[PDB]
Amino acid sequence: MKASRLYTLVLVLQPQRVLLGMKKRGFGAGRWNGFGGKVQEGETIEDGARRELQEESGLTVDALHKVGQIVFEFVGEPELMDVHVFCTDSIQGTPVESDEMRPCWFQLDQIPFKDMWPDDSYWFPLLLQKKKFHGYFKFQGQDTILDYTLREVDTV
């Protein structure tokens, strides 16, 4: 069996738009995404998600809601990425560019799927329907999915 490392992913989803950030360097650079990163020792997953949102987008929220979990496996990488996905609709400041991310709002009929991780085409629609989900995706490199599972769940 493989070990996994905890990561977070945060989507600010409002009734007509979603906040994404263009990843400027590092993992997933060049793709629009939610905000997030590695959970640190001692913090809850939700608190790590709140922290990453603030660090990468400038937004401070008091509460996030867990909407899904996605496990990523890469060919040649023994460690799995266990990504805990959170949403909120409620913000009260403006996003600001960070070293990691350039935030930008997208209308919900203009989700930039071609410039997002390929797996997002499968699970993001569930997030938009306010459904909860568990997923797993195995990648060869950055572009090619070799195997995946996706299921709606009632509890994440």
Binding positions for 8-oxo-ATP: 27, 35-38, 52, 56, 117-120
Within 116-155, the residues that bind ligand 8DG by CB under 6 A are 117, 119-120
CB of 129 to ligand 8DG, least distance (A): 17
Residue 21 binding Na ion, by CB under 5 A: no
Q: Which does 7 bind (CB under 5 to 8 A by kind): Na ion, ligand 8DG, none?
A: ligand 8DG
Stretch that binds Na ion, among 8-16, 35-43, 64-72, 119-127 (CB under 5 A): 35-43
Q: Compute the distance between CA of residue 112 and CA of residue 31 in angstroms, rounded to an integer.
A: 9
Residues found near ligand 8DG in the complex (CB under 6 A): 7-9, 26-28, 33, 36-38, 72, 81, 83, 100, 117, 119-120
